[PDB]
Amino acid sequence: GQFIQDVKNSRSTDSIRLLALLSLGEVGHHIDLSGQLELKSVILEAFSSPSEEVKSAASYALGSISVGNLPEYLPFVLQEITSQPKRQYLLLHSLKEIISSASVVGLKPYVENIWALLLKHCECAEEGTRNVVAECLGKLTLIDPETLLPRLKGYLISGSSYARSSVVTAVKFTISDHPQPIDPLLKNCIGDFLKTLEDPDLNVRRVALVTFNSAAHNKPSLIRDLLDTVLPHLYNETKVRKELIREVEMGPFKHTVDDGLDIRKAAFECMYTLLDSCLDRLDIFEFLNHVEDGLKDHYDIKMLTFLMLVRLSTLCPSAVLQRLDRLVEPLRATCTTKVKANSVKQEFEKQDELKRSAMRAVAALLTIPEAEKSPLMSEFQSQISSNPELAA
């Protein structure tokens, strides 16, 4: 009856179809539906729908029955992945759902086939397919890690840029907040994933920085003892390079395009995350000089640097005191800079939050008990003096 309701296009709303798909998926998660026909056809038909809710429900429910009966359904979807390229995205999502849900003892025989299919699909023209494949590889890494972790380990020697990026991305999903049996293995083999592959190329650098940020946010213990050999690489990543800036000019107008903004932003995010749990065992000055350097960085990084300054106002005030003279000049330039005329209205107001943020940051910095030194602070004309009360 649910099948008839799902397949009957006439007099059927999206909500009814979605509920029927969810009910069928939940029912098939426990009991076998292999003896019932007309399932795969209608499920694949529901993929071509004008609503994304129905598409997601059908993709989720396609592999739900496969949990009950892996041998009949898993080869079918595995073959459909390669056969039909216009629906392989939802098929890969369903495969990920099966891997997450199916029992490990029942999924062990097909581990080799799934790994081969994922490795063959590692190099793809579509980005979303690559992310889905990498996520599937990461989730598959959780089971039987002893056999397969060396295999991902050995791909670093001569893997391509896409392969290396996928390898670095896959290990990111393995880290969890709660303790896991894979913790000692990840602790012992994260060293080359971080140190040895910290600067092969650009995209690999970005994915390595993202993985490091995720590891620091989730499980700082893995990177607790490797900070000494990793921090200089991060500080190198926290520098502006004049070979990836491509300026596009049109008449009297300019449009700067930077490629390594993303890498610098990731490095700054890693630096910010390091304060939460990895602030004690680090040289504070080597952080503060780089904070000063990033104070004059892109507009997006300026707010992050102001937030870092606000956080450091409370944590270790003495170090900020020793560097209170060189931490305000960029902050004074931010509150004084003016934009060229004939610009759009939004370009007029975008400094109006940056200056307010700088005012807030210097006000927070002024809260140090012995910060009596006044580097020409008493300069309050009509325009600037408005910001104090707005910030307060």
């Binding site: 979303g128 995720s214 049109m250 008449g251 107008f253 707010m303």
Partner: protein
Amino acid sequence: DQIWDDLRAGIQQVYTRQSMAKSRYMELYTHVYNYCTSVHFVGLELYKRLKEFLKNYLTNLLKDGEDLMDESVLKFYTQQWEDYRFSSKVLNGICAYLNRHWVRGIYEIYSLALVTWRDCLFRPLNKQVTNAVLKLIEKERNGETINTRLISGVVQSYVELGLPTLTVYKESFESQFLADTERFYTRESTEFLQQNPVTEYMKKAEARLLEEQRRVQVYLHESTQDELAR
């Protein structure tokens, strides 16, 4: 009709992100200056042609990204927004002479482009983007690392449209984001108070407040600072 073949390919080259020198710029400006200075207000009928051009261009550009899902449509929208706004600014600079030749959606070349992009926003695709953004936020609440720049470029766009006026931003994004934030935090508090004691709940609440402050000061508008913290 006399001069439209030129000032069509030049406004077609502008919307292709290819460098153009200072000689092709003032020729198109001279075109507008000479057509408007015709004997007699005069020069108000090119607006319909420009509006039709922009509408057709956006309709053509729509078709490629209609089938994009979450985490994919966001990149396309962010990439197209900057190019479209820069091209609109260039076109407004081109029509500087026309900018003061009227006394009477919004009647301004830059505002015309913004309004046409707003019409490009009423379609269901925007909803998906919003959902995608929310999903990203949920991922940021789950411990995963996401690309912040994708969200901000969208959010600022919501600030720009609606002509600061934040009607579209509040109607489309702020209310839904606040609702999901309330639901997520209520569920998290309910699930945490059951097992773990209040001593750890205090630290978790402090960490969550700090994370929310970081998020609102990094990629959220300042107007949401006072409400969300409340």
